[PDB]
């Protein structure tokens, strides 16, 4: 487990362009990893801490490059 | 665009302002970039020497 | 029986800080309160006798 | 007729989620029925008073439980 | 060509009604034409000057009544 | 329905002449119609308000010219 805290980012999907979306993604982050690296701003989200991970997408103490690719994936634009 | 919840606790723990620290890095950052600009025009606008 | 207990708590200052579209967050408005002011109306009814 | 007035609510639909809508509805309400119970807030409307019903959907002096169901249904989320 | 300047207006497409769009329109305009008559306000655009026309739909020095109809065309409702 | 109140006029018929009558008429009137036009005087009547029309013949919010013909027809002389 993370053993500390879970910062839980839930992005809310939206229509960016014609027949295109930025898919909203429920994701959880181990708190020490989150405070170190998070790119989220202007991303149409809302965040809350929780003792246990509150979303089915869970990132533990050690991922880094696995998570660094997931947060910038919150901006992925799909049709 | 700093936060109102920040200056409450930051100024409580660190005693810093948290405004003049942002106003200090914006007013500086435009004065650095304006200054990096001309020195980036001189090297942009300069003929090739030794030619 | 204690299974389902009754609590009240506050707002994590991670949430409270950005509330109603700060730092790019969305869908989280503040709560609000109004007041209403409606009225009632009464009417006098007569009454009478004779001898 | 209501014989008092009509508050005409014109709601403008939006895209709530991926390929979804919160349906906009043009509706008229008897002004005493509107003042008593009206749920409109944040519904992206525009309201105006009128002497005669300005939209096809009309709620007269007595509907209540029919209208009270309709004004909350301005938020109906459809696929 | 206009030989002077071009004001490039890129209007972003929004969902005006259910399945009804305001078409996103890339357009360039000769600067003395755009200065004379330009209807753009609240059109959800972003504008930049240029030396050459930066978009494929170009309205040169002489169109006028074709551009006068084309900038108010930026509000067209497409089914 | 008038939705407000009904002023109920019950006229008692009488013998006006030799083998003649002014016949009695039980009628209800929407109160905002009753205040506007009521011709009743010397008609040998009695009046009470009520929330629901207490008599069979009912004149709602809008008759007017159909009621105005009726109230002064309380003086119709019959044989």
Curated annotation (Swiss-Prot), chains A, D, E, F:
It is found in: Virion. The keyword Secreted does not apply. Its main location: virion. It comes from the Viruses. Keywords: Capsid decoration protein, Capsid protein, Virion. GO terms for cellular component: viral capsid, decoration. Pfam families: Soc. Homotrimer. Interacts with the major capsid protein; three soc molecules associate with each interface between the major capsid protein facets. HAMAP family: SOC_T4. Capsid decoration protein which helps to stabilize the capsid against extremes of pH and temperature. Once maturation and expansion of the capsid has occured, trimers of soc attach the interfaces between the hexamer of the major capsid protein. Acts as a 'glue' between neighboring hexameric capsomers. Dispensable for the head morphogenesis and phage infection. Belongs to the Tevenvirinae Soc family. This is Small outer capsid protein. It comes from Enterobacteria phage T4 (Bacteriophage T4). The gene is soc.
UniProtKB/Swiss-Prot annotation, chain B:
A proteolytic cleavage by the prohead core protein protease gives rise to the mature major capsid protein during virus maturation. It comes from the Viruses. Belongs to the Tevenvirinae major capsid protein family. Homohexamer. Interacts with the portal protein. Interacts with the capsid vertex protein that forms pentamers. Interacts with hoc; one hoc molecule associates with each capsid hexamer. Interacts with soc; this interaction reinforces the capsid structure. A total of 960 subunits of the major capsid protein forms the 160 hexamers. Major capsid protein that self-associates to form hexamers, building most of the capsid in association with pentons made of the capsid vertex protein and one dodecamer of the portal protein. The major capsid protein self-associates to form 160 hexamers, building most of the T=13 laevo capsid. Folding of major capsid protein requires the assistance of two chaperones, the host chaperone groL acting with the phage encoded gp23-specific chaperone, gp31. The capsid also contains two nonessential outer capsid proteins, Hoc and Soc, which decorate the capsid surface. This is Major capsid protein. It comes from Enterobacteria phage T4 (Bacteriophage T4). The chain holds residues 269 to 319 of 521 of the full protein.
């Amino acid at each position: 487990a993370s053993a500390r805290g879970y910062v839980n980012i839930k992005t809310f999907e939206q229509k960016l362009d014609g027949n295109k979306k930025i898919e909203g993604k429920e994701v959880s982050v181990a708190f020490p990893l989150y405070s170190d690296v998070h790119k989220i701003s202007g991303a149409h989200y809302q965040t809350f801490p929780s003792e246990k991970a509150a979303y089915s997408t869970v990132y533990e103490e050690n991922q880094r490059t696995e998570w660094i690719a997931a947060n910038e994936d919150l901006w992925k634009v799909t049709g | 665009a700093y936060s109102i919840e920040l200056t409450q606790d930051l100024r409580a723990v660190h005693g810093m302002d948290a405004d003049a620290e942002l106003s200090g890095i914006l007013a500086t950052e435009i004065m650095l970039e304006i200054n990096r600009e001309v020195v980036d025009w001189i090297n942009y606008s300069a003929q090739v020497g030794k030619s | 029986a204690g299974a389902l207990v009754e609590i009240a708590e506050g707002m994590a200052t991670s949430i409270a800080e950005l509330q109603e579209g700060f730092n790019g967050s969305t869908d989280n408005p503040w709560n609000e309160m109004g007041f209403r002011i409606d009225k009632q109306v009464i009417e006098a009814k007569s009454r009478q006798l004779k001898a």
